[PDB]
Design a binder for this molecule. Structure first.
Ligand SMILES: [Mg+2]
Ligand SMILES: [Mg+2]
Ligand SMILES: [Mg+2]
Ligand SMILES: [Mg+2]
Ligand SMILES: [Mg+2]
Ligand SMILES: [Mg+2]
Ligand SMILES: [Mg+2]
Ligand SMILES: [Mg+2]
Lengths: 225, 63, 240, 52
RNA sequence: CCCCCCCGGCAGCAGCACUCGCCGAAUCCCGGGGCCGAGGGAGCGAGACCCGUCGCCGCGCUCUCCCCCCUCGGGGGGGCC
RNA sequence: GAGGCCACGCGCGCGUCCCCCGAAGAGGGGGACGGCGGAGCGAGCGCACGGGGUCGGCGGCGACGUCGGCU
RNA sequence: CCCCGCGGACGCUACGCCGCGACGAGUAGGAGGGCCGCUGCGGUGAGCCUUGAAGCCUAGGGCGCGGGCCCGGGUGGAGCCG
């Protein structure tokens, strides 16, 4: 039965290799399609603004639906409500970052913890840098580095997210399974901001760092990780 | 510093029998192996009952 | 079997080929090169000889160990890199081109100005600030421990001998065979001897380097002089 | 680190290789175009200054 | 000198004449300095025997044939429907 | 009709669409796509941004004076 | 049907060994571990010792995060330790 069992193991290994090849091709084509979608959205915003300006009107862009929140103050002397909301945002340490889906409830929570955080609207590059350099998964309650696509697939494949690109797409374009994809990510442990901060104790619009800076959160992220 | 609380970190539970009965320890070895190497939750329940104390293992009447 | 071909995928950036998967498929013509279907003797038999010793003997090579140590060390994991030194790529600073005047920073020839000829297989430079000028023979040196000046001579179309290699310039030693414990001093041979082959090579190289040095004024005086730091001058403000 | 390690990035995202190759080819083409256009401008300046 | 012209044309273009921005799926390449090297039996295969140059990933060549350019068989290219 | 890209590349039969004659707009002859149909298999060398360092690199110095010992 | 080779590291005191992740302030106080230490008893070491026990001294060599411990040299003179 030796020849037959050799044939069995060769057939099993070959089927496994073909399955891996098919999945890799699928991942490649999904990433290509995501690239097409990203450039379509980026050009669409410009085109809409251009036609409004040609007509002499104003094109108001959609209010951003994704935010990046970074806790900037430490854990000493925190009021109970601010402490609770920071725990619900999973910011239990200074220079911890989390993606937040923006709506009325989340925005009001951000207003509650406004002095303790700096938040803004990340762009595609910021999402890519954050997921690729500091992306860790919460797999079996453990902080596991996203070194393989199988780690994402085994935890989120039931939602259709099977690769780094799928995770980045779901985070960037806030999809149906954004809650699952975001909670799968361990909160980002960012370094100290290289080059320093302006003033962590005051709001951004008064020369400090706390509060909502609209899109300067990308500059903060570049210096931060 | 991290804003967590450490008062409930250590779960209080039996990981082994407090008894020194060698026969009990041998059959705890057997059911440790069975609970590890089988998916039968019955073996897990039996192992955790073997860990238990006498008040947590009350006698069962014939009736 | 067939003749090996060139890569057919030019490298534009390290790790990335110029052509895609389908492009390289068409370039390789994989559409028609499709295939579907179609040791060492451990023991040796030797005639033992002698009457009624049986026929022969099946003598195995690599007999089992006579002794086993009380305990061993587990084998290492695999590293997918870490090439030996002989296989390392050799990098040369862009300021060091053949004919450049270099300044030696270490050794007995400290501060002397020499002429660079070629990088060797180990990356060590081969220099000869000609022996008639500053007593520096054909000698190896390390590019990390030299300063490449701006002055150069055109040492193209001169013949560096082929045998001038790392094995040629490698140091030789005498000690210590046939001697274990030192009760009689083995300090003999400590006087290094300049080989006649080395003298011939030095003469051959210098006879064709020197006329090009004399071709520009007082470069021979420059090479005879040694480099030094005056109290007013600072190496970061100096153009070499 | 991906974004620093090419093969790690390719393991996580095989399309990054084709994006990177397209970017390198596009940048080389654009650089050649700009160099040629500047050289043509300089040659036109030389012609209009020394046209005799 | 300023404004409107009946209207401009050319070059360049957030300028390599350093006037004034925000950026990178609309981003790539290269280089330098510093600190570090933790781990140690990864072999479904021959039934291993020199110390598993192994897994995942990215590639090259051959099991097809023509040529081209240098060396004097070796190296570098175009492909071949 | 004198370029660029493709992680597109076996046949046979089936389907879907397009084309021709269309002698009932029948019946055949051709292209493109397919995720469709009962039947086993590629191996052989390499290079490596690839599951945590190696060198199949080297030098000098060593007894009554010096080498090492952060305790 | 393995055999030109008759061969193939270590392991698993399971109260052991191995892997991964997060975490580490602390009075009063609570708990665990102690191959930390003292004295005596039952066992055990075919234990140590007048060719030198205990104790003590020591710019001697070390081990342990630590409590502490081992060894060298001297003194001492009959018992001592795991
Ligand atoms: Mg405070
Ligand atoms: Mg600085
Ligand atoms: Mg305050
Ligand atoms: Mg801490
Ligand atoms: Mg505490
Ligand atoms: Mg520009
Ligand atoms: Mg190591
Ligand atoms: Mg504590």
């Amino acid at each position: 039965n030796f020849a037959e069992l050799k044939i069995k193991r060769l057939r099993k290994k070959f089927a496994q290799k073909m399955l891996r090849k098919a999945r890799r091709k699928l991942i490649y084509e999904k990433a290509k399609h995501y690239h097409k979608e990203y450039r379509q959205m980026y050009r669409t915003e410009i085109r809409m603004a251009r036609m409004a300006r040609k007509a002499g009107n104003f094109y108001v862009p959609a209010e951003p639906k994704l935010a990046f929140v970074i806790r900037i103050r430490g854990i000493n002397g925190v009021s109970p409500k601010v402490r609770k909301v920071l725990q619900l945002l999973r910011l239990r340490q200074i220079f911890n970052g989390t993606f937040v889906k923006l709506n009325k409830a989340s925005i009001n929570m951000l207003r509650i913890v406004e002095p303790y955080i700096a938040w803004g609207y990340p762009n595609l590059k910021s999402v890519n840098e954050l997921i690729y350099k500091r992306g860790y998964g919460k797999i079996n309650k453990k902080r596991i580095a996203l070194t393989d696509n199988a780690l994402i697939a085994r935890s989120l494949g039931k939602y259709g997210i099977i690769c780094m690109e799928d995770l980045i797409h779901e985070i960037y374009t806030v999809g149906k399974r954004f809650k699952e994809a975001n909670n799968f990510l361990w909160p980002f442990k960012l370094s100290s901001p290289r080059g320093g901060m302006k003033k962590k104790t005051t709001h951004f619009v008064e020369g400090g760092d706390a509060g909502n800076r609209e899109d300067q959160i990308n500059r903060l992220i570049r210096r931060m990780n | 510093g991290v804003d967590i609380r450490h008062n409930k970190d250590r779960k209080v539970r039996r990981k082994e029998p407090k008894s020194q009965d060698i026969y009990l320890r041998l059959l705890v070895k057997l059911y440790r192996f069975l609970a590890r190497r089988t998916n039968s939750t019955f073996n897990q329940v039996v192992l955790k009952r073997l860990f238990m104390s006498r008040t947590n293992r009350p006698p069962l009447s014939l009736s | 079997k067939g003749k090996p071909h060139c890569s057919r995928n030019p490298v534009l950036v390290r790790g990335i080929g110029r052509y895609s998967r389908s492009a390289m498929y068409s370039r390789k013509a994989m559409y028609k090169r499709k295939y579907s279907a179609a040791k060492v003797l451990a023991t040796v038999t030797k005639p033992v000889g002698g009457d009624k010793n049986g026929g022969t003997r099946v003598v195995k090579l690599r007999k089992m160990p006579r002794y086993y140590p009380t305990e061993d060390v587990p084998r290492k994991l695999l590293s997918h890199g870490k090439k030996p030194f002989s296989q390392h790529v050799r990098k040369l600073r862009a300021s060091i081109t053949p004919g450049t005047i270099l300044i030696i920073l270490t050794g007995r020839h400290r501060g002397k100005r020499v002429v660079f000829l070629k990088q060797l297989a180990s990356g060590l430079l081969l220099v000869t600030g000609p022996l008639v000028l500053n007593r520096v023979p054909l000698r190896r040196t390390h590019q990390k421990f030299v300063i490449a000046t701006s002055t150069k001579i055109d040492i193209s179309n001169v013949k560096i001998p082929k045998h001038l290699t790392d094995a040629y310039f490698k140091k030789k030693k005498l000690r210590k065979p046939r001697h274990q414990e030192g009760e009689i001093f083995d300090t003999e041979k400590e006087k290094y001897e300049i080989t006649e082959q080395r003298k011939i090579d030095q003469k051959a190289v210098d006879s064709q380097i020197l006329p090009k040095i004399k071709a520009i004024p007082q470069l021979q005086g420059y090479l005879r002089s040694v480099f030094a730091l005056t109290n007013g001058i600072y190496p970061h403000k100096l153009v070499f | 680190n991906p974004l620093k390690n090419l093969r790690i990035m390719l393991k996580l995202n095989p399309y990054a290789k084709t994006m990177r190759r397209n970017t390198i080819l596009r940048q080389a083409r654009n650089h050649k175009l700009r160099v040629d256009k500047a050289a043509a401008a300089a040659a036109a300046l030389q012609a209009k200054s020394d046209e005799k």
